[PDB]
Write an enzyme that holds these catalytic residues in place. Structure first.
Site, PDB file in Angstrom:
ATOM      1  CG  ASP A   1      -0.294  -0.112   2.519  1.00  0.00           C
ATOM      2  OD1 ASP A   1       0.931  -0.322   2.606  1.00  0.00           O
ATOM      3  OD2 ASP A   1      -1.026   0.014   3.514  1.00  0.00           O
TER       4      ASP A   1
ATOM      5  CD  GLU B   1      -3.452  17.052  11.392  1.00  0.00           C
ATOM      6  OE1 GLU B   1      -2.901  15.939  11.524  1.00  0.00           O
ATOM      7  OE2 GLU B   1      -4.329  17.461  12.174  1.00  0.00           O
TER       8      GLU B   1
ATOM      9  CB  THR C   1      -8.623  14.967  -3.182  1.00  0.00           C
ATOM     10  OG1 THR C   1      -9.164  13.648  -3.059  1.00  0.00           O
ATOM     11  CG2 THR C   1      -8.171  15.186  -4.610  1.00  0.00           C
TER      12      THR C   1
ATOM     13  CB  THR D   1      -4.319   3.659  -1.666  1.00  0.00           C
ATOM     14  OG1 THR D   1      -5.727   3.881  -1.788  1.00  0.00           O
ATOM     15  CG2 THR D   1      -3.848   3.078  -2.951  1.00  0.00           C
ATOM     16  N   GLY D   2      -6.207   3.241   0.502  1.00  0.00           N
ATOM     17  CA  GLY D   2      -7.012   4.088   1.348  1.00  0.00           C
ATOM     18  C   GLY D   2      -7.265   5.459   0.765  1.00  0.00           C
TER      19      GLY D   2
ATOM     20  CG  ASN E   1      -2.254   3.151   8.800  1.00  0.00           C
ATOM     21  OD1 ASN E   1      -1.091   2.891   8.503  1.00  0.00           O
ATOM     22  ND2 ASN E   1      -2.948   4.102   8.191  1.00  0.00           N
TER      23      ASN E   1
ATOM     24  NE  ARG F   1      21.106 -34.712 -10.186  1.00  0.00           N
ATOM     25  CZ  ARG F   1      19.835 -34.335 -10.266  1.00  0.00           C
ATOM     26  NH1 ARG F   1      18.913 -35.178 -10.707  1.00  0.00           N
ATOM     27  NH2 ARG F   1      19.485 -33.113  -9.893  1.00  0.00           N
TER      28      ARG F   1
HETATM   29  N1  ACP Z   1      -4.597  14.737   8.826  1.00  0.00           N
HETATM   30  C1  ACP Z   1      -5.532  14.645   7.852  1.00  0.00           C
HETATM   31  N2  ACP Z   1      -6.371  15.669   7.600  1.00  0.00           N
HETATM   32  C2  ACP Z   1      -7.308  15.592   6.643  1.00  0.00           C
HETATM   33  N3  ACP Z   1      -7.485  14.530   5.840  1.00  0.00           N
HETATM   34  C3  ACP Z   1      -6.715  13.424   5.999  1.00  0.00           C
HETATM   35  C4  ACP Z   1      -5.671  13.425   7.033  1.00  0.00           C
HETATM   36  N4  ACP Z   1      -5.055  12.233   6.967  1.00  0.00           N
HETATM   37  C5  ACP Z   1      -5.648  11.525   5.976  1.00  0.00           C
HETATM   38  N5  ACP Z   1      -6.638  12.230   5.407  1.00  0.00           N
HETATM   39  C6  ACP Z   1      -7.492  11.755   4.299  1.00  0.00           C
HETATM   40  O1  ACP Z   1      -8.027  10.474   4.614  1.00  0.00           O
HETATM   41  C7  ACP Z   1      -8.094   9.693   3.425  1.00  0.00           C
HETATM   42  C8  ACP Z   1      -7.722   8.258   3.747  1.00  0.00           C
HETATM   43  O2  ACP Z   1      -7.027   8.259   4.983  1.00  0.00           O
HETATM   44  P1  ACP Z   1      -5.671   7.418   5.056  1.00  0.00           P
HETATM   45  O3  ACP Z   1      -5.328   7.110   6.491  1.00  0.00           O
HETATM   46  O4  ACP Z   1      -5.730   6.331   4.015  1.00  0.00           O
HETATM   47  O5  ACP Z   1      -4.659   8.531   4.500  1.00  0.00           O
HETATM   48  P2  ACP Z   1      -3.593   8.043   3.413  1.00  0.00           P
HETATM   49  O6  ACP Z   1      -4.291   7.057   2.355  1.00  0.00           O
HETATM   50  O7  ACP Z   1      -3.019   9.204   2.684  1.00  0.00           O
HETATM   51  C9  ACP Z   1      -2.388   7.104   4.381  1.00  0.00           C
HETATM   52  P3  ACP Z   1      -2.483   5.397   3.788  1.00  0.00           P
HETATM   53  O8  ACP Z   1      -2.294   5.426   2.321  1.00  0.00           O
HETATM   54  O9  ACP Z   1      -1.327   4.497   4.460  1.00  0.00           O
HETATM   55  O10 ACP Z   1      -3.926   4.788   4.147  1.00  0.00           O
HETATM   56  C10 ACP Z   1      -7.109  10.294   2.437  1.00  0.00           C
HETATM   57  O11 ACP Z   1      -7.755  10.521   1.182  1.00  0.00           O
HETATM   58  C11 ACP Z   1      -6.673  11.614   3.031  1.00  0.00           C
HETATM   59  O12 ACP Z   1      -6.982  12.676   2.127  1.00  0.00           O
HETATM   60 MG    MG Z   2       0.889   4.125   4.630  1.00  0.00          MG
END
Ligand code: ACP
Ligand code: MG
Ligand SMILES: *[C@@H]1O[C@H](CO)[C@@H](O[C@@H]2O[C@H](CO)[C@@H](O[C@@H]3O[C@H](CO)[C@@H](O)[C@H](O)[C@@H]3O)[C@H](O)[C@H]2NC(C)=O)[C@H](O)[C@H]1NC(C)=O
Lengths: 1138, 362
Positions: free
Chosen positions: A368, A502, A611, A690-691, A834, A1094
């Protein structure tokens, strides 16, 4: 004694060095291949089982027992000297003259920025009455400042001169291993006055061990009681270890070696029952009958004498021989400089030594991104406020490079041209950096220079000026970013946050003029356009990766004098969560602005920008005071480490007014060129989890060329995301819609949900088919029975599976699904706290160490510097350590039965009475010193091709994914190759004696049976060691020496032990045998007939069914790899051309 | 600064001659091996074709022979002379009982009279072949005492040591005295006294001698040493009590160091054929003609239906006459020249050629 206080060390390794030896020895004999030696030692002491030297039977065992003891000593020392210098490395002073270290009842002073190896019960600090903050990061995902409000009564101590007047600690009960609870209370007796007081001690008055204190000074209090009262001694630390497939397909191969040993004793155990009821034999007159009694039960004793006789068949130097090779291959993974990150001072750190062959047979990498594949230094904004987009970028707008022209450098100068027109004019009342690569997005935002003397507030028009300024203040208030005193140039203070996302929001709001100077004890201070307004943030709710709500409830003042001041709610999350929480019906304009900004979010994800969007409801205090009571009672509840604060953090986010969104960028880890043609052209099927969202992950798989052009992106893409609570019993849509195209995408790959014809199949599937299943389309795909199989077979015939796997239970459930339901190796490379659920639920556990060492590195199975090193870790240091250890293990069951069956074929000629053939030193030095070294240096120093050519041609890894090296069809055909050569190494020494029993050139006779076992052993040692010579690639000076030394050690132990008088019957055999030319004539021609089957079959394979790794080696000797340099790393940023 | 060490061993860049078995290294290799083992296989059959041996069994001189010169079963005798000139003629033997030693199971004197047409060379070995004698069992070969071999006056419990060789069957006689050579090996010694000459009967009667010194290895006289007992507490073994009929005097205790035909018997043969040296003659070349050996029959070979014989030879460099090591080097030559021929006619007449690089993934 009576108060039951023993002293203990801090870390709980079970191998305490006082109790190291008896716990090891019981652990050594949980293996059932050396407790078999305790049977044939105690049966070697009973003086009827024909055994000479009964005390030399504990030589080939206890040598292996002590070598495993000093192996386990090193495997305990590296677990305590390199990863564990945090036991006791600091000693505090604790002076009491005016009357990291452990003592019960100590009163320890804790400054700022230090980890506490104690369960400290707080008393006071520098803040108001014991107001303590903490970063509890190594326990949960708690990146907050959790308040630890100490005792508000006894805040009268300041120094260690008045608290040192009391020598006292308390008594507590047994442990509980629950985090948020502390049921201890202290009572104390004041001096000179009869005031009794029970100072109430709760979880707010204490703090745990594995957390890091922040923002406070001189935290004071009492260390825990002995035993296990620390609440991390049970919650984490008991981890089950893991072994390979080859370390699990070995325990079948051991029992097949014990099936053969039980037959060779059973054939012997009945053929000396058949022999002891003949009538015309020689044993009646000369040898004296009725040995044990008047029965034929002297063939049942002859069973047991073959058990003692066949002790070089039970593999004793096996489980030490794998653990010498698994350790040395892992200490070569460690000691490589091309796996060393020079910018970080960090080589590869193998956490688990015993899994070096798992990296040669992996098929699924669950890499990821946004920690791993990228660089996570978030830079750009590309602001989208009020349905219009303000921002211009050509750093990464190149995700759609499929349809554009060759080079565009004039706009990268026009970015610089608008950059100098943006920093100067916005420098009106700002004192920050505002220079090249100090501000981040060149965009003329409304040309803010309108007021000079006539007005200060406006309130007449130009709402876009207000809506941008209200965006940036709500952006620079919804954060968890910390300021820090800059040591060099202290006139410009910097920002520090635990999230790279952030920190970027404030740091560019700094560049536009809305920067916050610091944080007070209750509210926040922010320098907004010269003046420093104090937005009092009374409450915040944290961020988790399972919720995607970064939300602060900062209180604003009422602009008119004399009102109740309202408050905001900036729920800054994802571009689908706050659109799932947005006000649909409205009297505002919150409907026709959504299709403007959500079109731009698609525009600003299709070019590769992460985004994250910003919404805000304008709540009042007639409705907030009950939610705050509903939250603070939930904050006072027991569920502060659970998901019951989430339902309280759900009720206020129901309706929102959308402000806008951001498009923060993320450049890569430059782990592009490994993912294109090294780590995905091998045959491994990558799985990015990803997430992040769908449009940004598709248009980043092209950028790293994970999925190139001509990939049929069969996106799943469910259309509705709603929760079910009633109805919908006669019909179904939200589960039936994705279910009907799990079958409809089986026109590309025609299959069915019924049977697994692909568990028995391995291939890198023709037909590209990158699945782009996403989020809730995966939650409704792994629900229950008979729904996984109709896409897991689709996920077998893919080459890439993709994004939106958020709330890491789904990343746990996917790596558990492809590991269980398809018995195959997974890899799961990640970083961040995570992704420990993905690493601890997989087979291999690769972790990325960023700037700091995180929990996905200290709970891992390896650790590399970047994603850039996985192509060398897998394709070189794992592909070798498969073909080394899958070649060693067939060679070791071969060498035990070229020898231990050659005294079974002698069993025919003494009628299986159990006479030894090998002097009982050649049976005792065979597993240890004669031919047990070249089998080791086959597993440690063999390379089929060079270290560069394993990366020029990465499709040589396909001999490990197919399991095309290690199988039982290789294992039995080496034992059938040993049982062939057991006939050659015995009956060629036998058929020179069988004619007339005279083999010496001077007729003096070598008819003795110990002088036959030098004809047998020297053929059984040299044709063993030359066999391993013909089954290693690249004969070097080192292993080519320890074959020439392990053959010249059987010629040397025969010279210095057949020259002493302690060798009773074997007095001078070096002069008698080697002077006889019948030895050197049966030695040069029975080494031939052991190799010749062999060596011709491995010349018949390499000519007319040649492996892929033979064809590459044919290119090695010719001019096909002349241009490649040694030490070639093709995934390196600054490298020459071929 | 934990950079790992870069000294070509943690970096794995050793000498690496890197053998690749192309058909222009394997096909000369089989041309190299098979051109050696058809010259070595020729020279071994050249040497071992010229070995002359005499094998004559005599386990039935007691019954199947008369006092006159008697029948000659061709089951017994085997002459192997490379000049096939007097190979079918029979070696005759008589039997002289004299009825004095009253043993009636193996007694008398078988007098084999054989004929050697060719001349042996200067070394002449007179072995004895004991077929079907079970000389290699578990209780048998672990029955002696090493200290009594090494000249030690051991006690009753020190010939009963746990360490391998003890004397658990032969520990003491009826009146509690230990044996001097204990254990079943020295107890079961071949008795049959061969004379120190091959008498040249019939033709000229100038005898051919055979010394019984130089029989074992001369280097074996460092663990066989003379006794140190006190001539009273030792008994003979219970199957030696008719060569030592009264027990031990002060002067009949055998020096086991120079008594070399006992030193051969304490070296038990590995298989169910036993061939030990008992008479040598290093000095004289044996001429042609008709010789006679006078074997004093005492050793019983009829309760186990075994054999007992005489192996007269001139042992060559390989030792004895065995056509094994000539056949095997020719089988080493025939297979290597066939595997070269099979892996060349599958190469030039069909099969593959090493001309491509698109065989792995195309
Ligand atoms: N501190 C923060 N403030 C606002 N939005 C946040 C944030 N941290 C993460 N996000 C948003 O949450 C969404 C998914 O959270 P996630 O924990 O997956 O962040 P990420 O995908 O960038 C880390 P990872 O890829 O390891 O999951 C992302 O699209 C991101 O924009
Ligand atoms: Mg990560
Ligand atoms: C070597 O020669 C001896 C005689 O010269 C051979 O005969 C063996 O002699 C002993 C002692 O006379 C016999 O023991 C006797 O046994 C009977 C029962 O069988 C018993 O009643 C007597 O009191 C006495 O103990 C023995 O039987 C006899 N034969 C054998 C086979 O041992 C001897 O055979 C020759 N060979 C060896 C290896 O000693």
């Amino acid at each position: 004694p009576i108060m039951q206080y023993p002293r203990n060390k801090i870390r709980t390794t079970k191998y305490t060095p006082l109790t190291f030896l008896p716990k090891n020895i019981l652990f050594q004999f949980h293996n059932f291949a050396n407790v078999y030696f305790l049977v044939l030692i105690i049966l070697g002491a009973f003086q009827i089982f024909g055994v000479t030297n009964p005390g030399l039977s504990a030589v080939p065992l206890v040598v292996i027992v002590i070598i495993t003891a000093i192996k386990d000593a090193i495997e305990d020392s590296r677990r305590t000297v390199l990863d564990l210098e945090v036991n006791n490395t600091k000693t505090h002073i604790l002076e009491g003259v005016e009357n990291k270290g452990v003592k019960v009842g100590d009163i320890v002073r804790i400054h700022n920025n230090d980890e506490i190896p104690a369960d400290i019960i707080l008393l006071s600090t520098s803040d108001t009455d014991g107001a303590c903050y903490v970063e509890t990061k190594n326990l949960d995902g708690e990146t907050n400042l959790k308040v630890r409000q100490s005792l508000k009564c006894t805040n009268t101590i300041r120094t260690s001169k008045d608290i040192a007047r009391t020598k006292f600690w308390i008594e507590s009960e047994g442990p509980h291993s629950n985090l948020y609870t502390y049921q201890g209370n202290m009572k104390w007796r004041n001096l000179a006055d009869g005031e009794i007081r029970n100072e109430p001690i709760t979880i707010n008055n204490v703090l745990l061990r594995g957390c890091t204190l922040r923002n406070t000074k001189w935290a004071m209090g009492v260390v825990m009681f002995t035993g296990g009262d620390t609440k991390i001694m049970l919650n984490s630390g008991i981890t089950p270890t893991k072994k390979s497939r080859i370390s699990r397909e070995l325990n079948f191969s051991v029992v097949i070696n014990f099936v053969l040993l039980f037959i060779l004793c059973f054939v012997s155990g009945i053929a000396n029952g058949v022999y002891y009821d003949k009538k015309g034999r020689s044993r009646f007159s000369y040898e004296f009958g009725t040995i044990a009694g008047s029965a034929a039960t002297n063939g049942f004793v002859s069973f047991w004498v073959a058990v003692i006789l066949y002790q070089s068949l039970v593999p004793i130097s096996l489980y030490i021989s794998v653990e010498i090779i698994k350790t040395a291959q892992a200490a070569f993974i460690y000691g490589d400089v091309l796996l060393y990150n020079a910018k970080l001072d960090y080589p590869c750190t193998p956490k688990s030594w015993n899994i070096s062959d798992d990296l040669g047979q992996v098929e699924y990498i669950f890499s990821d991104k946004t920690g791993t594949l990228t660089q996570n230094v978030m830079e750009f904004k590309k602001c989208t406020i009020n349905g219009v987009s303000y921002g211009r970028a050509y750093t990464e707008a190149l995700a759609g490079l499929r349809k554009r022209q060759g080079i565009d450098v004039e706009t990268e100068g026009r970015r610089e041209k608008a950059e100098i027109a943006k920093d100067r004019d916005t420098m009106i009342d700002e004192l920050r950096a505002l220079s090249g690569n100090s501000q981040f997005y060149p965009e003329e935002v409304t040309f803010v220079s309108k007021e000079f003397v006539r007005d200060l507030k406006g309130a007449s028009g130009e709402v876009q000026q207000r809506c941008c300024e209200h965006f940036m203040l709500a952006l620079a208030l919804c954060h968890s970013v910390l300021v820090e005193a800059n040591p060099d140039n202290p006139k410009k203070l910097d920002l520090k946050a635990q999230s790279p996302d952030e920190a970027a929001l404030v740091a560019t709001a700094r560049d536009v003029g809305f920067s916050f100077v610091g944080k007070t004890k209750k509210g926040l201070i922010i320098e907004m356009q010269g003046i420093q307004k104090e937005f009092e943030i009374l409450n915040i709710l944290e961020f988790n990766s399972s919720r995607k709500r970064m939300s602060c409830i900062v209180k604003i003042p009422g602009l008119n004098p004399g009102d109740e001041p309202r408050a905001l709610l900036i729920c800054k999350g994802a571009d689908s969560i706050i659109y799932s929480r947005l006000s649909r019906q409205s009297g505002s304009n919150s409907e026709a602005i959504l299709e403007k900004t959500a079109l731009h979010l698609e525009q600003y994800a299709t070019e590769g920008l992460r985004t994250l969007c910003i919404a805000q409801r304008e709540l009042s205090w007639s409705e907030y005071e009950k939610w705050n009571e509903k939250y603070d009672i939930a904050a006072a509840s027991l569920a502060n480490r659970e998901d019951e604060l989430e339902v309280v953090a759900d009720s206020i986010e129901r309706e929102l007014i959308l402000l806008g969104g951001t498009a923060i960028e993320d450049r890569l880890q430059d782990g592009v060129p490994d993912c294109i043609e090294l780590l995905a052209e091998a045959g491994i099927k990558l799985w990015v989890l990803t997430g992040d969202k769908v449009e940004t992950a598709i248009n980043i798989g092209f950028s790293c060329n994970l999925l190139n052009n001509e990939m049929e992106l069969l996106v799943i893409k469910t259309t509705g995301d709603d929760v079910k609570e009633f109805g919908s019993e006669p019909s179904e849509i939200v589960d039936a819609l994705l279910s009907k195209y799990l079958k409809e995408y089986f026109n590309l790959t025609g299959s069915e949900e019924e049977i697994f014809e692909a568990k028995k199949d391995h291939e890198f599937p023709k037909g590209n088919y990158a699945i782009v299943i996403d989020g809730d389309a995966l939650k409704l795909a792994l629900y229950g029975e008979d729904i996984r199989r109709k896409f897991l077979l689709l996920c077998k015939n893919c080459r890439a599976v993709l994004c939106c796997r958020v709330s890491p239970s789904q990343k746990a459930a996917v790596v558990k699904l492809v590991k269980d339901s398809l018995d195959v190796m997974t890899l799961a490379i990640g970083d961040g706290s995570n992704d420990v659920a993905m690493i601890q639920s997989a087979d291999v556990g690769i972790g990325i160490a960023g700037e700091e060492g995180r929990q996905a590195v200290m709970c891992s199975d390896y650790a590399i510097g970047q994603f850039r090193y996985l192509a060398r870790l897998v394709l070189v240091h794992g592909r070798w350590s498969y073909k080394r250890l899958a070649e060693m293990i067939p060679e070791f069951f071969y060498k035990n039965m070229i020898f231990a069956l050659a005294l079974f074929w002698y069993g025919i000629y003494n009628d299986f009475d159990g006479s030894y053939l090998y002097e009982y030193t050649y049976m005792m030095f065979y597993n240890l010193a004669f031919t047990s070294l070249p089998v080791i240096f086959l597993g440690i120093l063999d390379q089929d091709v060079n270290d560069t050519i394993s990366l020029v041609v990465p499709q040589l890894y396909r001999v490990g994914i197919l399991r095309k090296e290690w199988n039982q069809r290789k294992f039995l055909w080496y034992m059938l190759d040993g049982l062939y050569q057991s006939i050659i190494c015995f009956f060629f020494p036998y058929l020179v004696y069988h004619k007339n029993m005279i083999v010496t050139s001077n007729g003096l006779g070598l008819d003795h049976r110990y002088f036959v076992g030098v004809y047998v052993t020297t053929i059984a040692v040299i044709s063993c060691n030359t066999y391993v010579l013909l089954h290693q690639y690249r004969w070097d000076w080192f292993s080519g020496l320890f074959i020439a030394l392990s053959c010249l050690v059987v010629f040397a132990w025969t010279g210095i032990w057949s020259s002493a008088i302690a060798s009773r019957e074997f007095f001078k055999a070096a002069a008698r045998i080697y002077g006889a030319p019948s030895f050197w004539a049966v030695f040069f021609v029975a080494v031939l007939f052991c190799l010749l089957p062999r060596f011709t079959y491995d010349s018949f394979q390499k000519f007319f069914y040649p492996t892929d790794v033979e064809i590459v080696r044919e290119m090695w000797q010719h001019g096909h790899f002349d241009h490649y340099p040694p030490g070639y790393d093709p995934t390196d940023p600054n490298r020459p051309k071929v | 600064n934990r950079r790992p060490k870069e000294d070509a061993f943690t970096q794995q860049r050793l000498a690496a001659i890197n053998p690749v078995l192309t058909p222009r290294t394997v096909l000369p290799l089989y041309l190299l091996i098979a051109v050696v083992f058809v010259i070595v296989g020729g020279c071994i059959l050249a040497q071992n074709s010229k070995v002359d041996e005499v094998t004559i069994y005599y386990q039935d001189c007691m019954t199947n022979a008369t006092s006159s010169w008697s029948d000659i079963p061709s089951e017994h005798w085997q002459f192997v002379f490379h000049k096939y000139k007097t190979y079918n003629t029979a070696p005759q033997w008589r039997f002289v009982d004299d009825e004095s030693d009253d043993f009636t199971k193996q007694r008398g004197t078988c007098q084999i009279r054989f004929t050697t047409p060719s001349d042996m060379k200067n070394n002449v070995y007179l072995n004895y072949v004991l077929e079907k004698f079970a000389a290699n069992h578990r209780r048998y070969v672990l029955s002696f005492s090493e200290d009594q071999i090494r000249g030690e006056d051991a006690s009753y419990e020190t010939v009963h040591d746990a360490t391998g060789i003890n004397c658990k069957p032969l520990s003491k006689n009826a009146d509690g005295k230990i044996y001097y050579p204990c254990g079943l090996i020295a107890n079961s010694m071949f008795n049959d006294t061969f004379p120190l000459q091959l008498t040249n009967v019939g033709d000229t009667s100038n005898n051919y001698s055979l010394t019984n010194k130089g029989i074992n290895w001369e280097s074996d006289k460092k663990r066989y040493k003379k006794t140190k007992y006190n001539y009273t507490q030792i008994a003979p073994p219970p199957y030696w009590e008719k060569m030592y009929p009264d027990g031990y005097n002060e002067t009949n205790i055998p020096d086991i160091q120079d008594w070399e035909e006992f030193q051969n018997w304490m070296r038990p043969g590995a298989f169910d054929k036993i061939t030990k040296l008992i008479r040598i003659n290093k000095n004289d070349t044996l001429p042609a003609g008709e010789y006679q050996l006078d074997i004093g029959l005492h050793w019983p070979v009829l309760e186990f239906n075994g054999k007992k014989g005489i192996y007269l030879t001139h042992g060559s460099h390989l030792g004895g006459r065995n056509p094994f090591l000539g056949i095997v080097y020719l089988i080493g030559g025939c297979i290597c020249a066939a595997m070269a021929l099979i892996l060349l006619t599958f190469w030039l007449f069909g099969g593959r050629k090493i001309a491509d690089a698109s065989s792995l993934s195309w």
